[PDB]
Amino acid sequence: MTIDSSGYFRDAAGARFIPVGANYWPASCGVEMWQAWPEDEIFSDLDLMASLGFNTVRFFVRWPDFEPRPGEYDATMLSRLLRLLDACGERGLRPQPSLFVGWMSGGIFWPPWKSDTQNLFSDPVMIERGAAYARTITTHLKPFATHLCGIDLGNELDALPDCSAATPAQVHEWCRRMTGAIREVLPEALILSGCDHQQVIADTGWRLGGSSAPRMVPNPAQPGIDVLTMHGYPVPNWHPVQGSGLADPLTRSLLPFYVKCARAFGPVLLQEFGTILTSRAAAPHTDAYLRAILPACREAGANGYLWWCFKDIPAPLHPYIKNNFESELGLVDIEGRVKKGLEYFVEFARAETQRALDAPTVHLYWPRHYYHRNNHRNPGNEPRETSRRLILAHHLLQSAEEHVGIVRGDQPLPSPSEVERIIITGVFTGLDEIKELHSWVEQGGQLLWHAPDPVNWAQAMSRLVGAEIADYRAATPAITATDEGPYEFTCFLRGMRVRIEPRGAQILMTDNEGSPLVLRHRVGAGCVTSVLADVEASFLSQWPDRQTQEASWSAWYAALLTKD
Amino acid sequence: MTIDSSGYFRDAAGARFIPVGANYWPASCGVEMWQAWPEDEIFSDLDLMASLGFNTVRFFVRWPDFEPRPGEYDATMLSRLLRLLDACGERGLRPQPSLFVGWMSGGIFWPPWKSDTQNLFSDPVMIERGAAYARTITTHLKPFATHLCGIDLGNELDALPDCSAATPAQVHEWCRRMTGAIREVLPEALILSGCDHQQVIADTGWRLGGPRMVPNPAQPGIDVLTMHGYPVPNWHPVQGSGLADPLTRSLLPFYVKCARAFGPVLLQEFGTILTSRAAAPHTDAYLRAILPACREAGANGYLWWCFKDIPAPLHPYIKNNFESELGLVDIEGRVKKGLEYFVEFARAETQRALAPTVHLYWPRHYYHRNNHRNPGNEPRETSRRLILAHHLLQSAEEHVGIVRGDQPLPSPSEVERIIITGVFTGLDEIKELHSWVEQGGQLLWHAPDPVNWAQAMSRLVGAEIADYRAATPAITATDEGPYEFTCFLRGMRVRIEPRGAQILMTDNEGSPLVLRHRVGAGCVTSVLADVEASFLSQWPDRQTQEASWSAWYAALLTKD
Amino acid sequence: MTIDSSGYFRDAAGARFIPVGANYWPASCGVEMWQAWPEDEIFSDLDLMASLGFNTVRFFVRWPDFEPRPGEYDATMLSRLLRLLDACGERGLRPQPSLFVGWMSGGIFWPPWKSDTQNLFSDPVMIERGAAYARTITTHLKPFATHLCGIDLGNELDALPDCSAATPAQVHEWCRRMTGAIREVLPEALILSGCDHQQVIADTGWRLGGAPRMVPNPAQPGIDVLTMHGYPVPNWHPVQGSGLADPLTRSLLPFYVKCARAFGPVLLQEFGTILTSRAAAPHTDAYLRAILPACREAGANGYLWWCFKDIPAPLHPYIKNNFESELGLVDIEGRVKKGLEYFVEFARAETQRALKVAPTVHLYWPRHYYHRNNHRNPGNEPRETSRRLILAHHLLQSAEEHVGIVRGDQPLPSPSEVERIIITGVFTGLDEIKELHSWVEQGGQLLWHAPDPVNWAQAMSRLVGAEIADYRAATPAITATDEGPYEFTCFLRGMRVRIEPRGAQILMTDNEGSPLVLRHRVGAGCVTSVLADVEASFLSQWPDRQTQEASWSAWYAALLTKD
């Protein structure tokens, strides 16, 4: 099992395959599966999966179950593991076993010999016990090595409180150690991270973006990980921009946007996706939601699709008691029937696996230094702040009917024949980034620069924007108008506003009190359009008036975008 | 002493005893009393307390005075304690001595061998010296065991910063050790926590709601719960307006009701803070409201803070000089004008020692720190909503109680009507609520929670979620006027489709806002907005809005 | 050298000396100077400084270059350090070396054997390694003792993350120890802290206001000369000004200097315009002509610009904070940039004035200014306090007052020297209230914005002239002076009290009747008390500054009293 050059899974025989299926816990016992072991129920569920066309099943090796005392592995659980691996094989399902679990449905399930004082990532004993546990489980997977769908490091390790208390360096080291332990048994295994969208919207230490001989791996900030993962749900307050739900185009753009970011750093599996609401009343809306997000996730480059989760789980036990929405996430009801509203996933999965037998018209700028914790070279970017601006720009550009890509500022910029238009959404850019943006613009790039950064505004930025800072001025709102309507910007980058003097640039727009607000500067073959306001922040500050303002928000980008 | 079946003190004679009196430091020296020891002034203050009809005095054994070096107790201080205890008995006053002090009047006073890096609850050495210090003092109290009004563990231990750095489990264990230590000497002593209202409005590890049988197992070895309360606007999570404000006046009875649901409650500290002659018409009216209300909430005793004005020009009265003017009596030994009703009240309660129409819902999981079964409730958030609803309902002439969700719901004969004020409820609570509604209960459910909205919640509310919707304001009207709700639970709104429930009110865009659902013999009225948080968000407009706020509950409340 | 009784440097001959010059890194390499050592370029930059009339240059001994391994001091660096000191004396420039660097231009540069888990101030190994580093470099300085312009302890030690993790007592002891180490080698050296305006606007442990060797500010033991740094950048201050042209922005640096001056001698060790482009030239010129005399009037004893050269070196930290690349005084061809020539002129005038050898209102600096581990502090915190001080200071200057600072941790000067005091809603303990009572009785004129209810007992009642009858809803208070309406939305600690007079007169009421401003004669003086948080209310109206600011100045003028 291997990942091909276009980021797709390949089986031992070198044919491509698209993982499709479900994350799994039995209905009757949820997370207690290893203890309750309702084997007829499990095998009947695997039969149901196979009959729907699924070719993979993600399941969780719950660590306390398997190592109840330090170094003593439960032989009954290991035998149940082997029975499961066997039963999936005979039914055409490639198991995707998840080791470090850990985080699950609102609970946290660790071995009793780990105290809350022992940080999963940094504690010396936990590192050793974790490595031995990874090697032990991998040993028991080795007889199935060619029938796996990768080995999942753990479930949403970036959601753990332990991420706040361990340094990024320590998380990086733990990941190296746990992948290395797996490779002491299966050196060629495909390992997935198991992380969710907090890779994009927070700094948990689980990062997209390093610079690389340990192993050839696409994302060196996650050493030893062959396949990046993305998880995503429509719940409005699980994201830094609050959408309105299943019918909202903003909400629908979130998961494809996350996949697009991940895809820029390596192959990406949509390892978890769900509607959360799955009742009969929700059926018209969940159906339309799925018909939007799944093809968009495909176009964004996902290499596989696993629903959360297979069955409703009426088990009256932790953590389904305190977060009872977790009890009704099944693709399938009690009778083994696909729930009204969700059938499209079945149709899409069958389409995708028969498939396995263009272009973006604008790119959002991902800054060279994205994560802030212990980053001494970062000019001030923070994931939650950057990602709020990227999410909204991404959605509003798609409402202007643009095809939106991501371009990486920590890599040389693609020549303007590949990436022709770049939008910087008020993120902070260092000297090297400016120089490269200059050379890119010189060969013909069209740059739309929202709120260039005064902290990095010296000679280099002045020659690129085409203007010098004459003085600061009060950060009071700027009111203006394009040819389609009026605009008011209340936010400015770092809370500061500047008075500029043109030094090559033309004044494309002024505020209503006469001063320059949008500049336009031609530099070699390209053209820099700079806006002296924090556009995305201003729009986000007027979120309660979203209904009536959104059309003009999106019309803003269209008016200012130029073409060679 | 002993605590009877109804939560009141009993003396050796088996008579009911209602403690009435004051917390005490001397005027001339304040917290330095054990060092300065003005014995004549002290004994004369004890005289005046007795002449006023008091039967209890609360005073503080200040640990640094008694244990200036580890394991070395200061015999001079112990002599002084004996003289004090003797002087109280000779004068008719039951001493309530408070051990771990500690926290006092804006200062913190620990022995000099307790480093700032040594947490009081979790440090191994501190725990052992604490147990040893508690035993030692209880040894010197034993000669008076039949004359104490209980032993007070310490003053407002829940207010210490150490509460923040120690886990709830470590606080629980410290409480078990120290009460266990006292009981090695006086196994039958009545022990009191000494805690204030932060038991309700914060998670300090001093908790209402979970060996020798105690009423409140979260405080192991404690016999009598305590409550402290002052009208200061910004000492509470809802800003009242002071002595004349019915909201501020409802705060202390509210806290007492909450504590009373978990066990017997002494009103161990209450005061007006403002005691000047200019304040006198207002202190008089405030005390006339809260003392009867606290009685009806179930307080079993009343101790004023504090007995004398304290002009002592020393720490901590220099930096918080309002502490210098909390006396019940001036320096001429006269009860301050405006405070006299407390003497009248106390006399009345010791002479006599010879209702709900709706209940507020206290969630099963109240405290968040290291609580893995908690669906999201935090004391400050929950108490905010509870304080406001309690006050609004009392303005609607309702007599409000508290029903505990961590215990089986009483039948609708006892508790007929329940309001859930936008708190988070697990599956087990929903199932128990549904069973209680089945038997006739009337449920007013403000903001049923999407995170626990699956099948059980849908059958009880009588609707399923069709989708989320924008969390924009909901405007509506009852038959008495308009309403606007800007706050929703977890900052999310849902679109519902009915499945058995009627639509009672819509927002002015047509979509359902309030539902009403007959379930068995009872009825669930559900509001799809965070009602209490919305009102609280309109706090600047309280004066013009408060009337409709309490009208809201009156409009929606169901009776059989 | 020595500091005289007025607060000014004096050379060995006993003649007054005003440091004027620049902070320096070479343009080609920036902070890598010790490693790159472009000596020809360095020595000609020193020529340039002397030709401009400067007498002092401030440079930074970067620790990791001078001790790459514990206990082993690089000898090439020590020889380069020596050649640099030679070049300064050979050109009339007094070197001011900075030892603990450390913090520079948005980067942090420590030796590699210091891990990030080792706090500079509290880690025992770092403490002892630091003292040895101090003593070692001081030893290479003492050949030049009579030619230094003091020794600078470090650069903005108070900006370090370590300040948050080390207690104030730990920072205090570290400074005791490091100054002690310098004095082992040069017992009479002039030592400077190297701190900036965070001394005033935060609690970093680097504080104003505390047998040891007598120093002017005991909170910083062993420090002979306090330092101040100041830049116009709007969001580097707790009150957001509008830039080079904003009187508020221009008042900040003098305000910080006046505060530090109330505790000891102050060197304007860093100042700059940040914006130095030719487009900025009209505004830098005007900003410099304002702040430089005003800092002289505030008591600064020297002036060092940041920094001498533009630095295009494409290396850390110029890459992430590229504004740091264009702070030079002179351009690439070596001429003073347009808009900045006034500093050279002001420097030459200060040289001359030194060759030949007014406060109408005082702002109340509370007895307990810093909050960390201060058990006697009634609740003052530097950022809150300085926000109100800065605003009041600027507004009073706009009403054409000359504004001083009076220290509440010292006996109050008699009304002959300090006649009028303004308390800008800060928290006052009992001992401070009695001292204010005695001062007013002697004739003091007190304007008391927001007397603190937490300290409102009998002493405050007697001084204010009123008692608290009750709290009241903290809704806004609307009133009118003879010159316009006012609305106050902010009240101290978010609480509002209903008062009852007891000797005071009701000077002003709110538009619903209740007292708002009181006046109370006490002995020969007079207390005017406002029952609203004046400076916070004005700060809450910052978006409307442009239309509102004049009425804010007029508020102070209306209420200020005389005999």
Residue numbers in the entry:
A (entry chain A): 1 to 212, 222 to 366, 381 to 587
B (entry chain C): 1 to 210, 223 to 366, 382 to 587
C (entry chain B): 1 to 210, 222 to 368, 382 to 587
Please give the exact wording used by the authors of the publication that reports this structure.
We characterized biochemically and structurally the opit5_10225 gene product, and show that the enzyme, Op5Man5, is an exo-β-1,4-mannosidase [EC 3.2.1.25] that is highly specific for β-1,4-mannosidic bonds in mannooligosaccharides and ivory nut mannan. Op5Man5 features a 200-kDa large homotrimer composed of three modular monomers. The modular monomer structure contains an N-terminal catalytic (β/α)8 (TIM) barrel that belongs to clan GH-A with a sequence placed in the GH5 family of retaining glycoside hydrolases (domain A; residues 2–364). The A-domain is followed by a Rossmann-like β-sandwich domain (domain B; residues 367–586).
